[PDB]
Amino acid sequence: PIDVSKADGIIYPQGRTYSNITITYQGLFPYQGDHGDMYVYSAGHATGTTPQKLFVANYSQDVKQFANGFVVRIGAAANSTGTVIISPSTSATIRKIYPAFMLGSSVGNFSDGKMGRFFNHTLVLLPDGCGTLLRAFYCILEPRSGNHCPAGNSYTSFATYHTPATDCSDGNYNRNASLNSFKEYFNLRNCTFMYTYNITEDEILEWFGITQTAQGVHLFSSRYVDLYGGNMFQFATLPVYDTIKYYSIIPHSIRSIQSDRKAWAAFYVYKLQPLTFLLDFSVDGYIRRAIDCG
Amino acid sequence: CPKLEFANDTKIASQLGNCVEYSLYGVSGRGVFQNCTAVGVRQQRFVYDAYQNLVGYYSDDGNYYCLRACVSVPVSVIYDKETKTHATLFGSVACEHISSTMSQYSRSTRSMYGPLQTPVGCVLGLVNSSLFVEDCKLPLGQSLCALPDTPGEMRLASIAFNHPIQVDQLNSSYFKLSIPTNFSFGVTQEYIQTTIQKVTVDCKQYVCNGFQKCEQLLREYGQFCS
Amino acid sequence: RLTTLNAFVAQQLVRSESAALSAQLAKDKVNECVKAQSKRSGFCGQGTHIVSFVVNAPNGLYFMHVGYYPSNHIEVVSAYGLCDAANPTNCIAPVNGYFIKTNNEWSYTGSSFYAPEPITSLNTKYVAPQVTYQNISTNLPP
Amino acid sequence: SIPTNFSFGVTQEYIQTTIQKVTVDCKQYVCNGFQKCEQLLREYGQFCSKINQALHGANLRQDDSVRNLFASVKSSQSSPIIPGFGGDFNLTLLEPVARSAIEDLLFDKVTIADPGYMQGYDDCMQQLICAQYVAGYKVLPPLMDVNMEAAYTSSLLGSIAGVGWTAGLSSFAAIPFAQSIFYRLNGVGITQQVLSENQKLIANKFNQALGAMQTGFTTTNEAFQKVQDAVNNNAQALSKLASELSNTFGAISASIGDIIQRLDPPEQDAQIDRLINGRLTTLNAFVAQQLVRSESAALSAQLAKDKVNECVKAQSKRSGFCGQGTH
Amino acid sequence: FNDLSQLHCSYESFDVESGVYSVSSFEAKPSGSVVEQAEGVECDFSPLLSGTPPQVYNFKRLVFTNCNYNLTKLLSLFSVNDFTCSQISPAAIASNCY
């Protein structure tokens, strides 16, 4: 659970730093001691060296209100050995993962009738290159209508697969093969942009922030400056036209062969809403202590 | 921001030490920029206080600075009746300032030389004088007071202290005793205010003066005056 | 008009409370040092208060206090107690006065004026022998 | 029922005899030297004059009370300060080494905030009261020197050693302090004998109590808490004016220069009018608040004068007037 | 006129009471000004003049953040029949920074 006494994942003020002082701040926060919407990814089926049928959940049939944006804790399970989801007896080294998010306002049912088919013009963020690139866009998705394809027969869900024996080698990256993997299930039309972002790799805990405001969609990351702490600073302000109202996760698995499977981290999702906090900025300007009101 | 013909003497290093007007691309104001060790978030570039007053700024060169204001001195006056004797005082300041850097309206002439330093700051219109007054009427603060002559500048005397008659701390069994050898009657006139002038007031004659539409309009308030 | 009325009412209730408490003060001051002599230091007159007189005033009571105010204080030789050489137990102490080695011998004066006078029984009291007293033999006081 | 053992209680009391004198210009805080602001300030006008008259009269009454008390508490004749005073009584806190040691251990431990009485402008040129136009008002320097209140307390220290043997302010009788203490103990109902064989014992108990009140300068003293309360009351009073510049009372901003920078004259007239109405009401409340503080301080000054006359310049017989128990 | 002018105006009298009175203090003149901050490239306005202005229920926004502007190149070539500005002065809109 999130703790404000421990000062976990509180977004910084947008442009107004302080020093060594406390101040009230009305803004977008989560509550105290929230359970959240923690999920976790896993690898698909495999026998020996065989990339088999996938192994995912029913997230695509599920949807939640976008509300006031939210945050994601990334890397809370790394640095240690933990259980394997597809093989519960087996436990492997936990490697952190970075999930892909699709968001919009108009949702329908899939071709098999299951609810979740987003309509018209929607935004997808997708990390690629074994966690290096951050390709994001706000364009027109289209489901594929073939076998095991979202508009076609024998279809349950969709996922972006990860081939680690090829993708996670030194360099390489297969020209963002997870975007191809999504493109193995979908395609893209009437596209406003295809935005490219870089990041480094680590085994240190981190956060990510999403919100919507009338000027645009604010994207917050602490990887830019506060690697060793963690509190949310803007790097991106996406030029959106309207205000979104639905979010969902694109499911994602790994084409990891069974002989060399790897455990993965459980990322946490916490909604945000307007509340009021008190902030205790130290001399450094870093957030090390805050306190709730509600 | 619009297109701007950028000036060479608009860098912070270009105008160090003299308080000027910052226009940081929509963040405007005036004050004095001083060299400071780096405090707070570098990337925010703007820091305020609990009273939401901007305190410091990370300049683009890589040097951090602080600011308070274009502070100048408070100004006060002393004046004596029946001897047209006036003087000006500036609080807690070095005698830096002459008639140059002004605002509001003009000043008053004087017939001298200009300044004099005092513990409360600077004074125009006085001069040193080694006399000591216990019963000053117009004390200029701390321990200084101006005595007009019994007509030009006044006498900047210090406030005298009524140091009492010190007595000798004899330690033997004998004692040095103070004793009055003359006396007087003092007629101290005191007064205590006991009861103020008892007053009443009508509602309607006071508020309304006997006008009929007013008379219906009064009752909506009504009971307040009751 | 009613806001001015409310402010006037508030001000006059403040003035009335002040008037009541100050009237209690004036009643007290005409009680202590007027109908008697309040020995407390400077309640109604500086120094020691001696007498007072009371007159009216169109919104209060006006007081005149005649008080003692001394001057030309000099320094003299004084002590606490005298105890006999044969009888060190029997000692005397002044009552509202002082034993003064006069510049005419020990003598008595009051505590308010340089008024030397020959010491007798009436202005002193028999007291216990404390240490740091004076112990005369050539002319014992009565 | 009789007492058989005893001690000395160092009761700590404080009287806020005089609030800090504050002087503010209406024109600077309300207006900050803006021309159209000064033009609009004309109609309300005499509100400034009433505020200035009220604050000046309150300050004058405070100074008159100060003058009356200090002339009143002025011993007409006293004694200087020497080491070895008290002799046996270790009274090192009492002795002024240009101020008193106990005054230092009080004032320094008081959470104070940067006077800047000569180098305040230089303090702003160095790196609370450096705020002067930011504070918007002038702190009035105190009516005496700090050296002069030290001299007042010095005269008092000389006075109390001698006044407490004879009724009446006519003369002065500055007997060595130990005999004075002994006679004062004889007054409250203690025989001279137990004084005569236990001078060192009562001296040690006195010294221990003085050390305990000396070393007790912490939260355990309610007088320490109350003097900090008075300091914080002054702080809150000044911060009321300080933080109210941020208040727009409904205006789009607080920076009056930005107000005239962005907005046309006919509407900024109404905006500035709202600002100055809020400001003048706050100053009216401030004036009334220090008026209440001033009359409170005047009555407190009178009470302190009575206490220093009665249970300080004498050994009062009032049941616990200023000594918890007997004095 | 002088200090005595406001002193006399503060009491409604030609004959005043003597005394140390606080007077409205003055201000030292500004020493200059500094305009220092990093400025980016101009945000172009050609897409406004490019293509049909859309329907009133389909009006097309143009966001401008961290850019520059020269208003001289556009308003003289607009055949404006109505120029109003709510909550702000219509002339000095090009002046201030936002």
Ligand SMILES: *[C@@H]1O[C@H](CO)[C@@H](O[C@@H]2O[C@H](CO)[C@@H](O[C@@H]3O[C@H](CO)[C@@H](O)[C@H](O[C@H]4O[C@H](CO)[C@@H](O)[C@H](O)[C@@H]4O)[C@@H]3O)[C@H](O)[C@H]2NC(C)=O)[C@H](O)[C@H]1NC(C)=O
């Ligand atoms: C997970 O694995 C990572 C390695 O990927 C491992 O990271 C290490 O963490 C420690 C602990 O923070 C780091 O030590 C730091 O060293 C720097 C100087 O280089 C200090 O400034 C750091 O102090 C920070 O933290 C304090 C609170 O602990 C703050 O109060 C202070 O202001 C500083 O912000 C700290 O001492 C170490 O450098 C890294 N190593 C690497 C290679 O990154 C981490 O410990 C593992 N475990 C967990 C639970 O994450």
Ligand SMILES: *[C@@H]1O[C@H](CO)[C@@H](O[C@@H]2O[C@H](CO)[C@@H](O)[C@H](O)[C@H]2NC(C)=O)[C@H](O)[C@H]1NC(C)=O
């Ligand atoms: C930040 O604020 C704290 C809190 O007041 C300051 O720490 C105090 O410093 C004083 C000065 O010696 C000490 O007496 C207090 O005990 C300290 N309190 C605490 C809680 O640390 C600190 O100095 C301030 N730092 C800066 C850079 O302003």
Ligand SMILES: *[C@@H]1O[C@H](CO)[C@@H](O)[C@H](O)[C@H]1NC(C)=O
């Ligand atoms: C949203 O998507 C639906 C899907 O059919 C479409 O009918 C509708 O026109 C879209 N809305 C907009 C504003 O394009």
Ligand SMILES: *[C@@H]1O[C@H](CO)[C@@H](O)[C@H](O)[C@H]1NC(C)=O
């Ligand atoms: C995509 O853009 C083209 C060209 O502007 C347009 O003709 C077409 O209708 C668009 N398609 C959708 C689904 O908006």
Ligand SMILES: *[C@@H]1O[C@H](CO)[C@@H](O)[C@H](O)[C@H]1NC(C)=O
């Ligand atoms: C400010 O002071 C620091 C500390 O000495 C110094 O390193 C720095 O160069 C100074 N600033 C400038 C602009 O010289």
Ligand SMILES: *[C@@H]1O[C@H](CO)[C@@H](O)[C@H](O)[C@H]1NC(C)=O
């Ligand atoms: C006045 O003169 C005396 C001696 O000449 C000197 O000690 C004192 O500092 C002077 N004071 C001022 C204000 O010049």
Ligand SMILES: *[C@@H]1O[C@H](CO)[C@@H](O)[C@H](O)[C@H]1NC(C)=O
């Ligand atoms: C006391 O002083 C007054 C006036 O100063 C004088 O007339 C009177 O003679 C003096 N008396 C004594 C005893 O000195």
Ligand SMILES: *[C@@H]1O[C@H](CO)[C@@H](O)[C@H](O)[C@H]1NC(C)=O
């Ligand atoms: C002389 O005075 C001392 C001091 O009080 C005393 O102790 C002693 O008893 C006195 N001598 C006589 C004979 O009274």
Ligand SMILES: *[C@@H]1O[C@H](CO)[C@@H](O)[C@H](O)[C@H]1NC(C)=O
């Ligand atoms: C009186 O009490 C105190 C503390 O209770 C103790 O230190 C002291 O010795 C006692 N004195 C006697 C004479 O019993």
Ligand SMILES: *[C@@H]1O[C@H](CO)[C@@H](O)[C@H](O)[C@H]1NC(C)=O
């Ligand atoms: C008196 O008290 C002071 C204060 O701490 C101390 O330094 C000194 O040693 C004490 N002297 C005696 C004789 O008790």
